[PDB]
């Protein structure tokens, strides 16, 4: 589904969007090549090539990384153990943050 990728790929430029597709394509072709003692294309299943969502997800998580803005590598470090609701104040703080951001957007 294109919409998922469009939403998820934030801060990307055109060139990186092309590179993502290229890397995704490479994966199946690699799935069909066995290179252990001599490069040997199969050709017994090369008439069944398909590109699935898992290839896109893996390529997103491993190969291509944008060069602008904040990405997952930062949020991972700063929020190391996540947030746990141990009481009331957490919700109050988050609600105040929501109010402030909404005010900034609208006013």
């Amino acid at each position: 589904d294109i919409k998922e990728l469009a939403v998820e790929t934030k801060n990307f430029s055109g060139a990186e969007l092309e590179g993502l597709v290229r890397a995704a394509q490479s994966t199946a072709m690699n799935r069909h090549i066995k290179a252990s003692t001599k490069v040997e294309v199969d050709m017994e299943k090369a008439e069944s090539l398909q590109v699935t969502r898992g290839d896109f997800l893996a390529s997103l998580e491993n190969d291509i990384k944008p060069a602008f803005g904040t990405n997952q590598e930062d949020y991972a470090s700063y929020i190391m153990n996540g947030i746990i609701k141990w009481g009331d104040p957490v919700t109050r703080v988050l609600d105040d943050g929501e109010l402030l951001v909404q005010q900034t957007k609208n006013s």
Partner: protein, 107 residues
């Protein structure tokens, strides 16, 4: 797994023989990478040089799966003297910042 960075302070009166104990513990750690940062190799340096040297020593420790580092005679490292008092602020800030920087994930 939650705490990839721990630290401890050995303290006591003078001539109690503490640096030797730290060296013994480090040697018994059996970690692959062991380094000792001591003022003995920074005589006459300006504070900027000290900052850079400490930064380099620490950076070298981010490229291993297990590391142990020893800081020796902190007071001499800060150039402290009771009169005034008089010390180096820049190095103190460097240390304070550098005791809570987690390494690259998984080390």
């Amino acid at each position: 797994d939650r705490t990839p960075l721990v630290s401890v302070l050995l303290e006591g009166p003078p001539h109690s023989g503490k640096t030797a104990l730290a060296a013994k513990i480090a040697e018994e750690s059996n970690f692959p990478f062991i380094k000792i940062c001591s003022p003995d190799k920074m005589i006459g340096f300006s504070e900027t040089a000290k900052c850079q040297a400490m930064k380099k020593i620490f950076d070298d420790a981010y490229k291993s799966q297990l590391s142990c580092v020893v800081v020796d005679d902190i007071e001499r490292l800060l150039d402290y003297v009771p009169i005034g008092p008089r010390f180096s602020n820049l190095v103190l800030q460097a240390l304070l910042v550098l005791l809570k920087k987690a390494p690259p994930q998984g080390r």
